[PDB]
């Protein structure tokens, strides 16, 4: 031997001392409460409440507003015979081309 080294320790099994162990801590009470807080907070709170919050987030992307505006524009344009989509985004009168 070249050192005064400890031998490699044996692997410790949590089920030996605590057959109904959740694998969080060696202490049974702390292990049980760690399982309880993780499950409750994570699953219940985060998953369920965040999912319903995201589901019912207000339509700030203006999808339905854009649909209503498009409906009004289509109705007005096809009622008056105008093209449904104007070929230019900006006004050629307001655009000044070089000579």
């Amino acid at each position: 031997i070249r050192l005064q080294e400890d031998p490699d320790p044996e692997d410790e099994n949590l089920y030996e001392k605590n057959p109904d162990s959740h694998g969080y801590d060696k202490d049974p009470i702390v292990d049980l409460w760690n399982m309880r807080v993780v499950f409750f907070f994570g699953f219940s709170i985060v998953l369920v409440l965040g999912s319903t919050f995201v589901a019912y987030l207000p339509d700030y992307r203006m999808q339905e507003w854009a649909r209503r505006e498009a409906e009004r524009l289509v109705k007005y344009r096809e009622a008056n015979g105008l093209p449904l989509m104007e070929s230019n985004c900006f006004d050629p009168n307001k655009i000044q081309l070089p000579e």
Partner: protein, 459 residues
């Protein structure tokens, strides 16, 4: 963003003042609460971003990454508490402090509004990761892995710093809004070519790009479980976010300078999938799968079309979740048998059924299985690449075939077959491990249910 930044800086003293047996409980509970608070950033506008103040802003691209980071912190806490049972109280608190500092730096990086602050923070993320790897790694190669990771990132990113200060001197501002509104075309000159190279190469090394990726297998194999989870889930997404941010000022030079990177990305995607086909180590297989997916993201960003950006963002989120779940499963297998060899342990389906179910789900999400967000992102990228050119479909099909091949090869080798006779220390799966897998997999399916939240600003 202060309502999310300050709770992390309060996580730090809480962890350092908590009892010796309550550190994990307190950290997990309050990390979950912070994630729930950060879920409120997903309410974005369709016109512009959320400008909180002069320093921080949130966008449709920044919000999913912030939510992913905040959700990822407690999972890393669970895995770390798995593998650090015998550590001393001070060292446990130091590990939790490193994780908290990494999360804080990542949040500030994603919310930063200037390119220089973004650079400072995304370089500051190196120190906690390097310390974690080189201090709590298991094998000898952790030191070499840390050196490779550090020097690859820094050699990539220093020219980015020089180019950023040059751009500020030239134009007047590094603010993202100003450089977006006041953008001017980048003429075809050698100086512009080298500026483009500096920025793109920094973020490509961060991606990583094929040929500049060996640090990724070295670090991911040799890092502890928390380091492996954070490195693949989030730290690989800094390059993609940066490239999606800086490409505003690099046009139209990107049309001419993207060919070598596109060829590298496609061919290296094929090559890394082939490498996955012949891997004797599970963590290495997962690492090279990560490289292939990030190469696909690089292709999407380089082709740079509105359909490619949405696919890139969706694929980044999906890959983060999937790679984190795969690393967790491999870590449980390793803790069972104390070795990373793939063929050492077999029959884990007849020895551990629920873990076999988790493996099946993770491998199904790893390959593009509809209607998962993985498939959504991959399909958008494939469509954009098809519009770009019509042989990219050949390359993408080859990659998909090899991806399915190696994913199912890993699943069959680890789970199916007959159990190894001499391995009799495989105890039943823990409630902690099962909860970890469930919390990895359920958000992915919920994001599949609601997909517009991870498609970025181009949606």
């Amino acid at each position: 963003m202060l309502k999310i930044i300050i709770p992390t800086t309060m996580l730090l003293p809480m962890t350092w003042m908590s009892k010796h047996n309550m550190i994990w409980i307190n950290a997990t509970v309050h990390s979950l609460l912070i994630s729930l608070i950060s879920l409120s950033l997903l309410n974005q506008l369709g016109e512009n971003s959320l400008n909180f103040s002069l320093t921080f802003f949130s966008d449709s691209l920044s919000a999913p990454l912030l939510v992913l980071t905040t959700w990822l912190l407690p999972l890393m806490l669970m895995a770390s508490q798995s593998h650090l049972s015998k550590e001393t109280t001070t060292r446990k608190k130091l590990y939790i402090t490193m994780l908290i500092l990494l999360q804080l730096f990542l949040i500030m990086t994603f919310t930063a509004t200037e390119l220089i602050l973004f650079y400072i923070l995304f370089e500051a993320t190196l120190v906690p990761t390097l310390i974690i790897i080189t201090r709590w790694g298991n094998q000898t190669e952790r030191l070499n892995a840390g050196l490779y990771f550090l020097f690859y990132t820094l050699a990539g990113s220093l020219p980015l710093l020089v180019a950023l200060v040059y751009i500020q001197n030239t134009t007047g501002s590094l603010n993202f809004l100003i450089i977006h509104y006041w953008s001017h075309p980048l003429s075809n000159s050698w100086s512009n070519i080298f500026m483009w190279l500096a920025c793109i190469m920094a973020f490509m090394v961060k991606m990583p790009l094929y040929g500049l990726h060996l640090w990724l297998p070295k670090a991911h194999v040799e890092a502890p479980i928390a380091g492996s989870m954070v490195l693949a889930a989030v730290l690989l997404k800094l390059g993609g976010y940066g490239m999606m941010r800086i490409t505003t000022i690099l046009n139209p030079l990107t049309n001419y300078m993207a060919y070598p990177f596109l060829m590298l990305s496609m061919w290296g995607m094929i090559m890394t999938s082939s490498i996955c086909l012949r891997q004797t180590d599970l963590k290495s297989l997962i690492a090279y799968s990560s490289v292939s997916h990030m190469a696909l993201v690089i292709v999407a960003i380089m082709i740079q079309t509105p359909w490619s950006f949405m696919g890139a963002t969706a694929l980044m989120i999906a890959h983060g979740l999937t790679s984190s779940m795969l690393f967790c499963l491999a870590n449980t297998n390793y803790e069972r048998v104390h070795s990373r060899t793939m063929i050492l342990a077999r029959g884990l389906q007849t020895l551990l059924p629920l873990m076999a179910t988790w493996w099946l789900v993770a491998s199904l999400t790893n390959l593009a299985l509809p209607p998962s967000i993985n498939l959504i992102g991959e399909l958008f990228i494939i469509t954009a690449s098809f519009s770009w050119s019509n042989i990219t479909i050949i390359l993408m099909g080859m990659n998909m075939m090899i991806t399915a091949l190696y994913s199912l090869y890993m699943l069959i080798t680890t789970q199916r077959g007959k159990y190894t006779h001499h391995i009799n220390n495989i105890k039943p799966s823990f409630t902690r491990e099962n909860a970890l897998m469930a919390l990895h997999i359920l958000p992915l399916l919920l994001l599949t249910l609601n997909p517009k939240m991870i498609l970025g600003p181009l949606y």
